[PDB]
Amino acid sequence: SRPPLEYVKGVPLIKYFAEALGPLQSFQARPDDLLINTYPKSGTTWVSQILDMIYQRVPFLEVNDPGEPETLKDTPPPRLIKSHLPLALLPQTLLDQKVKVVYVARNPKDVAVSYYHFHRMEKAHPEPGTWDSFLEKFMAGEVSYGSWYQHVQEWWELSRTHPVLYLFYEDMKENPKREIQKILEFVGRSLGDWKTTFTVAQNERFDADYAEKMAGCSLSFRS
């Protein structure tokens, strides 16, 4: 009915995800688990689909389909877990057991455009309004799952002290092969569309804002 955003630990999320975040502190991560984590519209379903094939159900860590089965605890190892949850809301057990994570970072501008269209289709998400109204929220991190900047930067820093395979969405499009190899060697197994949406005014305001938030952060998204 296009409900407002509910904050959990200072991070905005849609009501349904916040509820499911309550019984999350009762999850126990196995040392052999594998987590696929990316900001919304950044390759979660893509990577999960690939890893799903290598192992041969990739459950969302923060979802609860009312009336249906929690099921991961009842699942045979090695388990595959997918989530869009930021490091700030990620179950502590995952970081404790040093579980391997496959993270994917996508171009900010492409994510904003895709997340916008997703907000229009998904009627349970808050009203995105105009493209300009939305872009303003995205930059202010006032969207479900919070700031893309924090989400993307925190997992980058964590990758320096934790088993995280930091991948880039662009590289999966331009060369799927070599990226699937990285994923295989990690788990230890073997086998500009935004330009038509962003106005020059919006793009300049974004680049200036991006230049400062990303100040002091080795991240680089070559074009």
Swiss-Prot record:
Transmembrane segments: none annotated. GO terms for molecular function: amine sulfotransferase activity; aryl sulfotransferase activity; sulfate binding; sulfotransferase activity. It catalyses: a phenol + 3'-phosphoadenylyl sulfate = an aryl sulfate + adenosine 3',5'-bisphosphate + H(+); 4-nitrophenol + 3'-phosphoadenylyl sulfate = 4-nitrophenyl sulfate + adenosine 3',5'-bisphosphate; dopamine + 3'-phosphoadenylyl sulfate = dopamine 3-O-sulfate + adenosine 3',5'-bisphosphate + H(+); dopamine + 3'-phosphoadenylyl sulfate = dopamine 4-O-sulfate + adenosine 3',5'-bisphosphate + H(+). GO terms for biological process: 3'-phosphoadenosine 5'-phosphosulfate metabolic process; cellular response to dopamine; dopamine catabolic process; dopamine metabolic process; epinephrine metabolic process; ethanol catabolic process; flavonoid metabolic process; norepinephrine metabolic process. Its EC number is 2.8.2.1. The active site is at H84 (proton acceptor). One of its GO terms (cellular component) is cytosol. Dopamine binds at D65, K82, S83, H84, E122. Its main location: cytoplasm. Pfam families: Sulfotransfer_1 (PF00685). Gene3D superfamilies: P-loop containing nucleotide triphosphate hydrolases. Liver, colon, kidney, lung, brain, spleen, small intestine, placenta and leukocyte. The keyword Cytoplasm applies. Keywords: Catecholamine metabolism, Cytoplasm, Lipid metabolism, Steroid metabolism, Transferase. Coiled coil: none annotated. Sulfotransferase that utilizes 3'-phospho-5'-adenylyl sulfate (PAPS) as sulfonate donor to catalyze the sulfate conjugation of phenolic monoamines (neurotransmitters such as dopamine, (R)-adrenaline/epinephrine, (R)-noradrenaline/norepinephrine and serotonin) and phenolic and catechol drugs. Catalyzes the sulfation of T4 (L-thyroxine/3,5,3',5'-tetraiodothyronine), T3 (3,5,3'-triiodothyronine), rT3 (3,3',5'-triiodothyronine) and 3,3'-T2 (3,3'-diiodothyronine), with a substrate preference of 3,3'-T2 > rT3 > T3 > T4. Homodimer. Belongs to the sulfotransferase 1 family. This is Sulfotransferase 1A3. It comes from Homo sapiens (Human).
